[PDB]
Amino acid sequence: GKLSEQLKHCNGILKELLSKKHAAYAWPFYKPVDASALGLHDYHDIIKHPMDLSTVKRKMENRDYRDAQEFAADVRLMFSNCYKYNPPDHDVVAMARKLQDVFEFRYAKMPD
Numbered sequence: 001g002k003l004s005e006q007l008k009h010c011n012g013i014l015k016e017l018l019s020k021k022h023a024a025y026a027w028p029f030y031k032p033v034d035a036s037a038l039g040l041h042d043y044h045d046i047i048k049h050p051m052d053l054s055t056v057k058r059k060m061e062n063r064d065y066r067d068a069q070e071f072a073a074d075v076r077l078m079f080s081n082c083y084k085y086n087p088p089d090h091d092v093v094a095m096a097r098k099l100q101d102v103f104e105f106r107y108a109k110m111p112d
């Protein structure tokens with residue numbers, strides 16, 4: 001089916017985002033933001049819907065995503081949270097921009 005084939009492409013992208021190739025800029029997105037550990041006590045007041053690649057991986061593994069659009073919405077939510085919370089000149093935003101470039105260019109190669 002088309003949805004299953006598109007979800008295989010999505011899983012391929014997810015594997016790439018978690019791969020050693022991108023680890024130098026992907027690592028902040030590997031696990032949920034630990035606001036308390038980072039001293040960011042305003043994080044959960046500003047970010048209402050946290051998202052990270054471990055959560056996307058669990059949702060893919062559990063067949064939670066019904067289509068590519070639903071998968072992409074979570075990956076973009078993860079980047080949007082970073083752009084909303086952090087000053088735009090922060091290193092973590094530079095890392096987000098680089099990983100989002102990897103994501104958007106490969107997502108665009110979605111099979112029809």
Ligand SMILES: COc1cc2c(cc1OC)[C@@H](C)C(=O)N(C)C=C2
Nearest residue numbers: 028029033040081082085086090092
């Ligand atoms: C490099 O220091 C930071 C790491 C992280 C974060 C802010 C950091 O410094 C401000 C949070 C808020 C975030 O957006 N992500 C994606 C994860 C980790």
